From a paper:
To this end, we employed α7-AChBP, which is a previously designed chimera between the human α7 nAChR and the Lymnaea stagnalis AChBP and has 64% sequence identity with the α7 nAChR ligand-binding domain. In the present study, we expanded on these observations and engineered α7-AChBPVS, an α7-AChBP with additional humanizing mutations in one of the allosteric binding sites, known as the vestibule-binding site. The neurotransmitter-binding site is located in the ligand-binding domain at the interface between each of two subunits, whereas the channel gate is at a spatially distinct, yet conformationally coupled location in the pore domain. The vestibule-binding site is an intrasubunit site accessible from the receptor vestibule and located opposite to the neurotransmitter-binding site.
To confirm the structural integrity of the vestibule-binding site in α7-AChBPVS we also determined the X-ray crystal structure of α7-AChBPVS in complex with α-lobeline and the allosteric binder fragment 4. Similar to our previous approach we took advantage of the 2 bromine atoms in fragment 4 to pinpoint their location in an anomalous density map. Unexpectedly, we observe that fragment 4 not only occupies the vestibule-binding site, but also another allosteric site at the N-terminal top side of the receptor, which we termed the top binding site as it was also bound by a different fragment molecule 1 in our previous study. Inspection of the anomalous density map reveals peaks (shown as magenta mesh in Fig. 2, B and D) almost twice as intense at the top binding site compared with the vestibule-binding site suggesting that fragment 4 even binds the top site with higher occupancy than the vestibule site. The fact that we observe fragment 4 not only in the vestibule site, but also in the top site could be explained by possible allosteric effects of the humanizing mutations on the top site, or alternatively, by the slightly differing crystallization conditions for the α7-AChBPVS complex compared with α7-AChBP in our previous study. In the top site, the carboxamide moiety of fragment 4 forms hydrogen bonds (indicated as black dashed lines in Fig. 2B) with the backbone atoms of Glu-9, Leu-10, and Tyr-62, whereas the side chain of Leu-10 flips outward to expose the binding site. The hydroxypropyl moiety of fragment 4 forms a hydrogen bond with Tyr-70, which is located in a loop connecting the β2- and β3-strands. Additionally, fragment 4 forms van der Waals interactions with Leu-6, Tyr-7, Leu-63, Gln-64, Val-76, Val-78, and Val-107. In the vestibule-binding site fragment 4 forms a hydrogen bond (indicated as black dashed line) via the pyrrole nitrogen and Gln-121. Van der Waals interactions are formed with Leu-54, Leu-89, Leu-90, Pro-97, Leu-100, Thr-101, Pro-102, Ile-119, and Phe-142.
Residue numbers in the entry:
A (entry chain A), B (entry chain E), C (entry chain D), D (entry chain B), E (entry chain C): 0 to 204
């Protein structure tokens, strides 16, 4: 569409994806949740879990807003995430890079709200010695910004999902809880928030 | 050809491959089909299937059309798919990224119709516990746009293929059916279409 | 050389490597041959062969010619293949992308004749159930353009090679024959050519 | 922030990340330390250790400083490490490239001090034949600049860490020492510094 | 340094890394040597050797020289090898691409002499059936330009190294010799030089 093309032309003009879109010392609030689509494997010897997780991230970037009357009909645009600022959220437990299974695209609406929903295949470290018991194994998946404290990037939780779990995998999901925290570290004056998912599962065997 | 060179020079001038080529709120219709060239492996423990599939996608991009009388002789051009908009179609069942086996080129004709026919090696999740039975295992391969609803991208089916199947693999293909759906999701007002291929196969023994 | 530098400066100026260098509806003739340097492995379970093959491709690109009297001393130049048009030749039997073992460079002479001789490590599909028999296994390696028909790209065969075969591998090469064909496909009006190498080999044990 | 955006615009203008930011023949001092987060595996046959290590590097780049009164509020910025000069520090014992697990971002303050803290998964060569003894196996992890001698890049040590070690891995960390050295090599007039970590560990079983 | 920054700015201005820096039909002399740091593995079944080798390459590029009085203090610069012309030297025996373990940087001095010293992990083909004998296995590692004959690129040998060999690997290095040759091939009028390293080794038991 013609108004879409003009809209994209304006991004490349003025926008720097390296700059976190804070304003007036207000943080950028990033909503974060997770759906555990699969447990692919559990390596009992090496204390590693292999999962597919669907992350849901959303935030407002004030630099991405436009006047709906100046680009009529254009309600949302699909945009390569590499051309936007994105949260530098890291899974602390990860022992390999993530493999992103989905197109690397974000949805952005007229008031600059961005939705980025990557599905990833990820291996991470966890004590899984309980996995063949009734109790199962319980792993923590701690997520947080690598470089931004609470006054720059305000990580916030949202309602999660057991409904995406693939029923035919050889592990059953006993449950998932989630918790947001602020911690300090000896380096830095300001607190860093994290959102941690506690996941309990066991072998169907 | 000299007219070919002038024709390509015009693409780089006006064209943004990030923008879906809708016009007048009309969707872009994308025709989608599949030929299952091979079942390479079936991992019974991890519930994974390894295939080579040949996808056939085609759509019209109105920005790619030209006057055949102004570029005489030039009936179709071979073009890197990376310089065109392409459908963000995803295999929902995939547990790894696809490996594209074919040149990343599309054919485009004078009225802007694009053919993109990648062959991919792909591993995906499926309940394969039936694979050593007469009934075999039946897997769904659901394909759909990750970011575009029906009013932007109208996914449509076409005539599929058993004729490419490699006869000497250790799995025999019992059959393939296909089905198009529109579904809604709790988020979004507009429906997303998918095309799903149901594939039944079994070990030869 | 100083004349070499001026010669390269002229490529970047006028040349588009995406455009097949046909002229006056005449095809570009591409000469194609192969030397099978090694059979690395044969996977009897998965019906896969692992080889190193040395391809020899050559064609004339009329846009790459220059006046030898205007660039004196410059008889041929070594050029990154990515900055030239190259044939989009594909091994139809391949089940993984190729791994190129050689510098990605082509030789080009003053009348625009290009030599490109990549050595590749490649795994491909083949019925190898005969490999521990006197008859051995016989595999077809079919090569062809993915996007260009006979009137654009005229694929032509040349004299091949058993002399590069590594004598100490655990497979012996019984023989190699080669054949050029034209086929039609239901889509397209024009025929596509291929060059197929039939390779027979067996386990030494 | 608006002052943040103007600040980044000035980097791209004047700055070359290939140039080591020495001044007045003074070296760039790079502070270096390590936290050994995990021993993932030990390959006794191939004499290889697989670890995750968290490196802490910091240096001053005089070209990155700014006036705090001219960019009010802007105390530190998060920046892609690829757009800054970075130390070419190498783990001498490495037998594969590193896999970086963290966002490739550095913190930079107003006086051009840069903090870069990558976590890496890395396999390296070590005599591990002692690993199931009380004494354990003792490995050297020698780190140093690949191309800069002491008068250009002054590598300096800092206080290290056993406290990050994951308690549930099947190896226990006995102890870590660290040592800085200057050596000469027959080639070169100037000495090269290194920082070496000696790490002792053993199988728990 | 300020003079360093101006020096780099001049490279990007005038220099093309695709052009071999011959002058007055004189070849570019490339000095080549090798230190075999490790034998990682020997695959007896597939006739493959896995090594880490440290290559030492040096040549003069007349386009890289500068006046020391015009860039005072600047004696050598560390430069990404991708921004310089480099020899297209190939290990003829290689069955996989190399993995470069070192920063991809070269040293260049004021008279345009370039030092490039990559350490690589490389698997290559060799008859290793002797590896469990007193005699051991003897492999040839033949290195040479892929596209340049002797009158363009004059490959020359230098004094090599057993002193880097890791003492704790399960193979002992019996010896390494080296030899330079000129050969002709039926295609081409001019001879191609190579430098071959003969390496003898055996399992320690
Ligand atoms: C951007 O970030 C950088 C790094 O954090 C900051 O630069 C540092 O600034 C601090 C504070 O000014 C410096 O700390 C001071 O350093 C003095 C010199 O230290 C060096 O030299 C001595 C030997 O003479 C060594 O022992 C020492 O390890 C260093 O090599 C010290 O003398 C100071 O110590 C005294 O004051 C402190 C504070 O009151 C007392 O607690 C001490 O007991 C002591 O009496 C002091 O530690 C530091 O050197 C700088 N680091 C670097 C790496 O350069 C920038 O300030 C920051 N920019 C902005 C705008 O904030
Ligand atoms: C650029 O390279 C090409 C390819 O190497 C050169 O063309 C080839 O030149 C050979 C040798 O001269 C030709 O063979 C000759 O054919 C005639 C009969 O037709 C015969 O009299 C000779 O004995 C010899 O066999 C060959 O046909 C030709 N091949 C192709 C594909 O064009 C070309 O000369 C080079 N250009 C320049 C400017 O050097
Ligand atoms: C940049 O580094 C290169 C390589 O170290 C330097 O070139 C080398 O310079 C030395 C001393 O000038 C040369 O030695 C001389 O060689 C000649 C001819 O063979 C001989 O007759 C003399 O007795 C003397 O030994 C050396 O050959 C030369 N090497 C190469 C490969 O060119 C260069 O000088 C350095 N430049 C600066 C400014 O540091
Ligand atoms: C852009 O998207 C956001 C998020 O979907 C919309 O903001 C929400 O608006 C609804 C009420 O209309 C409420 O759920 C919340 O108050 C908002 N959510 C958040 C996360 O801020 C916003 O309306 C959209 N803008 C437009 C113009 O459509
Ligand atoms: C470009 O290709 C498309 C698809 O092959 C052509 O559209 C078809 O036109 C024929 C008319 O003979 C119809 O019967 C088909 O049903 C059309 N298909 C679709 C999807 O539109 C188009 O005509 C071609 N353009 C040119 C100039 O040849
Ligand atoms: C179609 N898709 C979303 C696409 C979208 O709007 C989107 C994409 C990318 C970024 C931002 C938004 C909208 C909500 C449904 C979802 C698909 C399903 O939940 C799903 C996802 C992953 C595995 C299995 C099933
Ligand atoms: C030759 N090729 C197509 C090439 C083309 O025109 C094309 C390429 C790329 C984009 C658009 C069109 C046209 C239809 C036939 C096909 C070849 C065979 O079906 C095949 C496909 C996959 C594996 C094995 C064999
Ligand atoms: C030296 N080299 C070629 C290099 C060249 O001129 C060339 C390179 C790239 C493009 C165009 C031409 C020319 C023909 C001989 C060949 C060497 C041997 O046959 C060989 C090839 C592959 C594996 C093992 C041995
Ligand atoms: C939050 N994070 C650092 C982030 C930061 O300031 C930083 C990042 C990148 C560049 C420069 C600075 C500061 C120190 C604490 C650390 C987190 C924890 O110790 C940790 C590190 C590695 C693995 C597991 C856990
Ligand atoms: C410090 N380093 C070289 C670094 C340099 O100046 C250099 C780097 C890159 C390009 C040109 C020159 C110079 C010669 C010594 C070498 C280190 C040692 O041999 C070594 C190599 C590999 C494993 C263990 C030890
Ligand atoms: O340039 C953009 N917004 C500024 C408003 C100018 O009217 C913008 C945001 C997104 Br998402 C795109 Br595409 N462009
Ligand atoms: O590992 C992560 N960060 C590194 C990015 C590439 O260097 C990461 C990001 C997200 Br979202 C997850 Br889950 N992990
Ligand atoms: O997984 C797919 N897309 C990922 C994009 C890169 O992150 C994908 C596309 C198609 Br067609 C298939 Br099958 N999978
Ligand atoms: O720019 C193109 N066409 C529009 C102008 C008509 O003269 C165009 C289409 C394709 Br396909 C290429 Br390449 N360029
Ligand atoms: O798979 C092939 N082509 C895809 C595009 C580049 O990877 C291919 C080409 C050749 Br030659 C072989 Br063998 N495979
Ligand atoms: O510019 C080139 N050819 C056109 C002729 C201009 O007089 C050219 C061909 C090659 Br190969 C290079 Br490098 N440049
Ligand atoms: O095969 C080599 N080069 C191909 C192009 C770059 O990947 C090569 C060079 C050297 Br030195 C070795 Br060992 N292999
Ligand atoms: O440009 C920067 N600093 C110089 C000040 C000129 O106004 C600079 C440093 C960093 Br980190 C960024 Br982003 N910009
Ligand atoms: O610019 C450079 N040399 C061209 C001649 C001007 O004196 C040059 C060489 C190297 Br290494 C760099 Br960085 N720049
Ligand atoms: O090998 C290293 N550097 C080369 C650049 C590409 O990997 C390296 C750096 C560090 Br820190 C480690 Br550990 N390895």
């Amino acid at each position: 569409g013609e108004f879409q093309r003009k809209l994209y032309k304006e991004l490349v003009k003025n926008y720097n994806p390296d700059v976190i879109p804070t304003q007036r010392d207000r943080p950028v609030t990033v909503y974060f949740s997770l759906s555990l689509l699969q447990i692919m494997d559990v390596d009992e010897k090496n204390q590693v879990v292999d999962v597919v997780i669907w992350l849901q991230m959303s935030w407002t970037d004030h630099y991405l807003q436009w006047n709906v009357s100046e680009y009529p009909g254009v309600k949302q645009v699909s945009v390569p995430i590499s051309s936007l600022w994105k949260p530098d959220i890291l899974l602390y437990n990860a022992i390999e890079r993530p493999e992103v299974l989905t197109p690397q695209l974000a949805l952005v609406n007229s008031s600059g709200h961005v939705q980025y929903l990557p599905s990833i295949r990820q291996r991470f470290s966890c004590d899984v010695s309980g996995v063949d018991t009734e109790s199962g194994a319980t792993c923590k998946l701690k997520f947080g910004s690598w470089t931004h404290h609470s006054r720059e990037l305000d990580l916030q939780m949202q309602e999660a999902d057991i409904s995406g779990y693939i029923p035919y995998s050889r592990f059953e999901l006993v449950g998932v809880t989630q918790k947001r925290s602020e911690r300090f570290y000896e380096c830095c004056k300001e607190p860093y928030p994290d959102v941690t998912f506690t996941v309990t599962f066991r072998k169907k065997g």
